[PDB]
Structures are given as C-alpha cells and as structure tokens.
Design an enzyme around this catalytic site. Sequence first.
Site, PDB file in Angstrom:
ATOM      1  N   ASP A   1       0.774  -1.352  -0.026  1.00 25.74           N
ATOM      2  CA  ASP A   1      -0.171   0.285  -0.023  1.00 25.74           C
ATOM      3  C   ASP A   1       0.828   1.202   0.142  1.00 25.74           C
ATOM      4  OD1 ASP A   1      -2.058  -0.674  -0.466  1.00 25.74           O
ATOM      5  OD2 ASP A   1      -2.979  -0.149   1.576  1.00 25.74           O
TER       6      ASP A   1
ATOM      7  N   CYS B   1      -2.268   0.827 -13.776  1.00 23.92           N
ATOM      8  CA  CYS B   1      -2.575   0.515 -12.526  1.00 23.92           C
ATOM      9  C   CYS B   1      -3.859   1.600 -11.972  1.00 23.92           C
ATOM     10  CB  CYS B   1      -1.191   1.102 -11.437  1.00 23.92           C
ATOM     11  SG  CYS B   1      -1.164   2.359 -12.230  1.00 23.92           S
TER      12      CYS B   1
ATOM     13  N   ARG C   1       3.251   2.816 -10.856  1.00 28.54           N
ATOM     14  CA  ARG C   1       3.721   1.137 -10.946  1.00 28.54           C
ATOM     15  C   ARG C   1       3.817   0.944 -12.870  1.00 28.54           C
ATOM     16  NH1 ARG C   1      -0.685  -0.737  -5.805  1.00 28.54           N
ATOM     17  NH2 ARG C   1      -1.722   1.503  -7.491  1.00 28.54           N
ATOM     18  N   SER C   2       2.468   1.673 -13.363  1.00 26.66           N
ATOM     19  CA  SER C   2       2.402   0.473 -14.868  1.00 26.66           C
ATOM     20  C   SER C   2       3.941   1.431 -15.073  1.00 26.66           C
ATOM     21  CB  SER C   2       1.273   1.227 -15.987  1.00 26.66           C
ATOM     22  OG  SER C   2       0.275   0.714 -15.020  1.00 26.66           O
TER      23      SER C   2
ATOM     24  N   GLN D   1       6.597   7.361 -10.632  1.00 26.66           N
ATOM     25  CA  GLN D   1       5.637   8.744  -9.368  1.00 26.66           C
ATOM     26  C   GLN D   1       6.744   9.321  -8.226  1.00 26.66           C
ATOM     27  OE1 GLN D   1       0.940   7.765  -9.676  1.00 26.66           O
ATOM     28  NE2 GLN D   1       1.498   9.741  -9.087  1.00 26.66           N
TER      29      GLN D   1
END
Length: 287
Positions: free
Chosen positions: A181, A215, A221-222, A262
Amino acid sequence: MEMEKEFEQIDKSGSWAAIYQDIRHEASDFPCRVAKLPKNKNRNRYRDVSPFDHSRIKLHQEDNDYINASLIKMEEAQRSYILTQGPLPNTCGHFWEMVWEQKSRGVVMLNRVMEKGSLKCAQYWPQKEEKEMIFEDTNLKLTLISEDIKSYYTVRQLELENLTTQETREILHFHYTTWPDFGVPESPASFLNFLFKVRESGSLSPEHGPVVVHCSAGIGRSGTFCLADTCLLLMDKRKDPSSVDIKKVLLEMRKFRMGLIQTADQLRFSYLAVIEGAKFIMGDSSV
Ligand SMILES: C=C(C)[C@@H]1CC[C@@H](C)[C@@H]2CCC(C)=C[C@@H]21
Ligand SMILES: [Mg+2]
C-alpha cells in the site's frame, strides 16, 4: 554494470530525490486538449493525469472517441505498450472496446480494486465463470474461462466476444496482487518473476497488438513495468549491454505519457529490477 556503480554511487550520496527531480524537470510537456474538453470530464479518473493528444488511443466510434490511454512506442526495442488508468464505472465498456480494436492479447493490472480503503478501480471483469458481463454501450460480452491464483499474482483467461459480429478472442489477464500500500517491494524477485510470466504468455510479442498496462492512474507502477521490460530488452539486443541508460529510456517513454514513475523510491526500485533481471539474461538461466 555501469548502472550498478551508478546505483551504488547514488545510494552512497543519498541523492535519489535529486536525481528524480531532474528527470521531472527535463520531461516532455505536450498538449492534452481532448482530455480536457468538458464532454470528457467523467472519462478521467484524476484531473492531473491526462493523455497527450499526439499519442492517445482513439476509440473507433463516431460520437466520442476519447479514452484516458496512451500508446508508448519504443522504436529501438521494437516493443509497444498501451498505458491506461484503472477503468471507471462508466468507462468499462470503452476499456474492452479499446482491447478489441487494438488486438491486444494481454491486460496487466498492477493494483487491487480497493487500496487504502478506497476504490482504485472498477470491477471490470467477471469473478465467476457462470456470471458473464455484458457491456451494452459497446456491444461486447466478457466471460471468465479459468483462473490460476498464486501467492503474489493471479492469471485469468477470459473470452471477449464482439456481439456485432460474433467473433471471439481469448484475453489473458495478469493481476499483480501484492504491491504494498505504501512504498515499493523490498525485493524485485517477485516482480521480475511476474514480468517473465507475462513474456512467456506471448502477450508482449509483435504478432499481437500492444499489451494494456494499468494501475490506478496508469503512470506509477505501470511505468515501472514498462521501463524494466524495455531496459532488459535493450540489454539483450545490443552489442554493448552496459550502454543501456535507464534515465534516458525513462525520458523517452515520458514523451508518450506524462508522469511515468511517480516517486524516487519507484525510480530506485526500477534500477534494482533491471540490475537483478540482467543477471538472469546474461547467460545465468538458473532458477
Ligand atoms: C525470479 C527470481 C530472480 C527468483 C529466484 C528465487 C526464487 C525464490 C523466486 C521465487 C521462485 C522462482 C521460480 C524465482 C524467483
Ligand atoms: Mg522540459
């Protein structure tokens, strides 16, 4: 492995945040006018995450061709990816229309439907074989065929039917289910194993349309998934493997979709995955 001494030097100097900010400064800034039209406001999950006009995927339909999705075309690597946001309750039919029209074979999902107690994504595929889903706005039917649940990820086989023409295609859904998370995985081993499962399926291969990666916003994450895949492909192809520069590959991908990778720990994790995956492709086949 130049990157590996670059890695150690940046860790030693504690300068990941400064490296990452320099990437943010030099990244491309192209117009996103279609994404911002008022008629498209409910097609976007986040106001600050839009596709550039020059690389956006257009739905093949009069009325409204807009979807929040970008084609990332890596020329030297000979690989293409579609990056998209997690579908919205009203964009699930557009999502599967895009999959049909682009001739994709695999969908890669890097988030869970609920994270941090909020909905990051619509439940856009059927959870039970006997309860298929109909998307009437785009005239497509989606059926779960089977699923293989493992510790870190799940693979589903689905059938997508064009109700207009009654053609059917098989789609593989690859669901990474254990991204933490907060932060990034401590070890890239399970992420690399996931990446190689996607490769072995054929879903990343030039006989198929581009793989669809998402995502929640389609950048974090992508971006890590595509960055690692392309970097490892370049190291395989090239006469000089240690000539592959992660930061220049990242900036090239950012010409096609904004915001890829990110945080600074996602940047650091990307190095880790490429460094570790490079062992497993320089001749060291063992596991
Ligand atoms: C891909 C990897 C670098 C690792 C190698 C060691 C295993 C514990 C781990 C889990 C099992 C499989 C098949 C490989 C993974
Ligand atoms: Mg700039």
